[PDB]
């Protein structure tokens with residue numbers, strides 16, 4: 001009857017994941033996921049990080065995730081307005097830099113970094129799987 | 133109910149697709165897919181080709197597919213002996229040479245290349261999706 | 265017989281150019297440049313603007329330039345008191361807000377942005393080269 | 397009477413460096429430096445590596461250097477044929493993969509990696525300074 005995830009997505013755990021086939025800025029990447037009733041990558045657990053790390057281990061490219069902020073004294077937040085759970089990962093790089101478009105997190109070679117949201121990167125959309 | 137593909141595979145059309153965890157000559161890549169109840173990638177259409185190109189678009193690795201021949205005087209055949217549909221893609225690369233283990237094709241950055249089957253590469257495995 | 269520019273600077277045209285070492289506010293950045301017998305960047309021509317754009321093309325950071333104003337009713341002026349030539353660039357960003365310490369301009373990704381001079385950024389310093 | 401380095405280059409120590417203004421594949425990047433009587437970045441000392449790490453500390457982008465090999469059966473060699481100096485840096489990433497157009501080294505966030513030479517990346521050209 002109901003398939004857990006659409007074709008071309010990857011079903012893992014409670015979620016479905018879609019890896020982009022090209023690089024786009026964080027805003028365009030966000031809009032792609034919204035149009036598919038999804039959101040940008042939200043890592044909720046170490047299991048989620050390990051899965052993503054394995055999936056992107058084929059790649060040296062950067063992948064946008066749904067974590068951002070505009071002010072470096074204020075918390076990183078996922079698009080849904082929740083914070084980065086402690087003990088998942090450290091955002092490396094120039095975490096204190098502000099940019100006109102804000103600061104956004106990306107994963108590259110398994111490590112998470114801060115960067116100018118205006119840069120074009122691959123991205124990963126995530127939605128809940130249709131489980132029972 | 134019955135999900136079309138196991139977790140961590142890509143469901144596309146009537147099949148499920150998986151990237152190999154490691155890099156191996158073509159024979160060992162063939163044994164690995166068979167031991168997972170699958171076979172090496174078989175491209176039956178340009179839509180298959182487009183899907184695969186998109187799926188590997190974030191990787192620069194070569195991926196073995198199930199296409200091979202013993203030397204240029206034999207036709208290109210898939211693992212199950214069926215023919216290469218000639219107009220789907222041109223096999224570039226080492227198409228004049230003869231190797232002790234034969235010639236095999238991999239996909240890299242959208243294009244298909246002939247290469248010595250003894251060379252190590254990643255691969256893509258494929259099995260039937262569980263539909264209706 | 266003597267060198268146009270010190271080591272680690274970039275000689276272009278009749279001047280020498282240097283990236284700041286740290287990301288600070290416009291005030292402090294103007295001071296560090298004065299330390300080096302230099303001033304903040306003054307863009308005097310499209311040729312100057314094109315050189316800077318190429319010089320920062322491998323950076324996503326913003327770089328303070330020597331352009332600033334007290335409010336949207338006071339004109340954009342370089343440090344030497346001279347005005348911004350309109351054809352060089354339109355200033356984007358916060359061109360209608362009013363900050364205590366004024367509005368300052370930085371260049372990023374080829375474009376120029378107004379921003380509170382309190383906020384921290386890298387900067388480009390400029391001084392005259394020793395011509396023939 | 398002559399300048400150490402041409403305009404738009406960075407003079408450092410005994411050498412001149414030219415950062416690319418865009419991202420290009422390794423063959424194009426190499427062709428660029430050759431057209432300037434130069435070569436791609438050759439790191440022959442810890443001092444060179446340290447200097448390059450600070451010059452690219454403004455950037456999260458990848459920069460091609462002049463170190464390459466056709467496949468793992470060939471040795472890692474600089475463009476001039478000299479070997480990778482022992483104990484200077486490790487080439488990280490997938491050093492044992494075989495690409496159609498060879499494997500090239502790049503620096504990113506101070507670390508050196510192997511990648512498919514067909515990718516587009518920034519680059520750095522290097523030439524002897526014309527000095528005393």
Ligand SMILES: CCCN1C(=O)c2ccc(Cl)cc2Nc2ncccc21
Pocket residue numbers: 023060061062120121122419458502511515516517
């Ligand atoms: C969003 C950018 C993706 N990307 C890299 O991140 C990248 C990574 C490494 C190298 Cl050497 C060169 C690179 N340039 C590049 N070229 C073609 C396709 C992808 C890339």
Ligand SMILES: CCCN1C(=O)c2ccc(Cl)cc2Nc2ncccc21
Pocket residue numbers: 062063106115119120121419456457458516517518
């Ligand atoms: C050759 C690739 C250069 N590059 C990055 O390396 C890069 C680095 C990080 C992120 Cl998040 C996204 C990136 N994409 C990107 N977009 C525009 C200009 C440059 C880049």
